[PDB]
């Protein structure tokens with residue numbers, strides 16, 4: 001079995017290997033990459049996402065989110081307070097202000113220490129889930145707006161044609177902006193490209209050990225667990241590396257820099273934080289190997305998780321027994 005310790009693997013495809021996206025995911029899996037739940041892909045030196053980032057300031061962040069924490073430094077939840085709209089140029093100025101900017105630090109490990117010590121005492125503002133793309137239309141390789149759709153994959157594998165669409169999302173971050181512990185909708189893959197700015201630190205649990213994370217989360221967030229049998233779908237809970245280590249939970253960590261892709265694999269729980277002002281683009285995708293994970297994915301039916309239109313068909317076709325209850329939680 002390849003990669004039996006479930007380490008995060010880093011890949012350096014050549015420009016020739018960068019042509020066929022599906023083939024390269026399958027290659028990474030042949031080397032055991034999925035066992036980690038996360039892989040890094042460094043694009044060939046010849047590749048670029050677009051020519052420059054000099055003209056993005058007028059993109060609108062319609063609903064910036066202030067991420068307010070509750071709990072203790074290593075075990076906390078966050079809620080999202082809606083703020084008034086602002087442009088990317090306004091948000092960048094805000095991220096660089098004395099109130100929000102990255103503190104002085106020695107290296108990524110020192111910054112990670114400071115994040116876990118101090119995150120809860122601040123409320124950073126995140127631009128999330130903004131439909132759109134920063135890939136140039138002429139970028140033919142690994143263009144996250146031109147991937148094969150999840151509806152076409154389900155139709156190819158299973159023969160059933162379904163409604164729905166699959167488009168990318170932009171994220172504008174600042175110091176301390178935080179992504180809570182989660183798997184993707186329907187335990188899909190994700191791919192994330194860091195277009196510009198400061199790094200993103202990731203934590204990930206191997207898919208084979210995801211239920212160990214879920215059991216710890218039920219212990220640490222006991223009221224939330226009584227409220228919902230899949231409350232990590234709410235995307236509000238944080239647990240630090242120190243707490244994970246104290247409780248014997250297998251995990252790994254890595255820092256993504258501008259110009260790098262990350263892939264999350266089906267049922268790979270992940271969480272992380274941004275180092276400073278940045279912009280990322282991400283989308284979900286599927287492969288034939290995903291179908292069995294989609295069929296077994298947990299679901300929130302309490303009403304909190306609320307998701308896209310396109311998830312309806314996935315539940316309806318892959319999980320017909322759960323469909324009625326889940327749809328009630330959607331309405």
Ligand SMILES: O=C(O)CNC(=O)C(=O)O
Nearest residue numbers: 171179190191192280282
């Ligand atoms: O970058 C972010 O805030 C969150 N992204 C992801 O969870 C992802 O790409 O799957």
Ligand SMILES: [Mg+2]
Nearest residue numbers: 056057058059
């Ligand atoms: Mg613009």
Ligand code: NI
Nearest residue numbers: 183184190264
């Ligand atoms: Ni994710």
Ligand SMILES: [Zn+2]
Nearest residue numbers: 228300302304
């Ligand atoms: Zn729920």
